Amino acid sequence: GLIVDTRDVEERVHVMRKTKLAPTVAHGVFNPEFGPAALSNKDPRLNEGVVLDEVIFSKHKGDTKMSAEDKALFRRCAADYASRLHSVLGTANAPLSIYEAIKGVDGLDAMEPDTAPGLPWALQGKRRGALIDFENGTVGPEVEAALKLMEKREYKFACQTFLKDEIRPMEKVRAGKTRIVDVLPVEHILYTRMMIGRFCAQMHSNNGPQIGSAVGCNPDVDWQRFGTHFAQYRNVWDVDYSAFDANHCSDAMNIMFEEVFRTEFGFHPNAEWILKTLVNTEHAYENKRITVEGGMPSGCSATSIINTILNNIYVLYALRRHYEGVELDTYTMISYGDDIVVASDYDLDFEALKPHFKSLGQTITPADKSDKGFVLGHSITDVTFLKRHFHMDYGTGFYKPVMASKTLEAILSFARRGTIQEKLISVAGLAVHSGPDEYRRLFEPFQGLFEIPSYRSLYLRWVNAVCGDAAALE
């Protein structure tokens, strides 16, 4: 988005720290071009002389303002998508009773028991459980207060800013491209799902090429569902954005909320508000406290949904801004946050869409970095969604998600002390689709040191998930 002022005031939020990820026995075998993100502005590997802070906030290249016409077009693309959305989700998007907004409902998972409470709960020292009784299902001291200042529309907050302790490609590592996570005051999160937690519930439940959402899916089995649907079309695109979240122009966000969360659909008239509050944000990075217009903060709940909705509107907006009478049925797509896959029998020219996406402030580019030219013909077995490729299972004919071996090795090369054993299991689930040989190889350097799930043990478990009958009938 756009920085309106970089200031230094009073306190200092200590986010400075080390990485807890650590090389495993695997690292000394695969030696991945991957490594932990720079967490200290003086990290020994920072490519010569570059500042951490400098890089981190350099994604806010500004906030694209739109022409009254482009606006009206977006508002039309929203009124159309938001239509076909609720028309399939029903208007069961009413609010949530406090209790539900904590324990979740059929679909929506229960709020996070205890993770970074945000501001001002930290410049005060204490947990979420130390404010809200998570075991119970209701508020607390300052909680119900904030809850009412919000209820009356008085509430205003500040976004805490975290650092992403994660594995990244050695290049981006040295470039100092450590990602940040705006962790908001937990009451804001609570009221958000109280406003649209029911909307999100249905969202998760009906994920698919229909509503164009992937949020709430289980890639391990929904890959068959998805795979087949995208096997009908002529062309398949694997679009790629640059800081998708950070570049959502103020006008886009404000207009999307307005059109997608109307009381006309059963929402509360404070849905539009609580969402509009996400536009102009204040971020506290140590002693620094910055004001950021535009762009959506990656950290708040519903983030993936909001981004998905956006991503869907952008595709309709962009196309109409170049084609003749484009309708939602002209194409088909499905996105998860910013990750996206589009399909259409028409031979659309995404290369001619860079501008129309630019009008929104989104720089689009093809995934497979080859000749960076939006080519055609591409099929389901070229694109990569959620870092998982669509592979035909030569054993059951069903599709299975395969992560590039390299990328997998990276996951196995770094693990915080002692978690190895449980991760090796989790990660093992992801690697079973790389075949039996690559499975063995990816874990080969672990035998006699840990419990490696037999290749059979997992294949069979996956089989009775993609199609429970297919397991018995065979």
Binding site: R168, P169, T407
Partner: peptide, 15 residues
């Protein structure tokens, strides 16, 4: 390449 890296997240946590 772009800021878009290959080894990070996938979904929030379990469904």
């Amino acid at each position: 390449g772009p800021y878009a890296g290959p080894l990070e997240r996938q979904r929030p946590l379990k469904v």
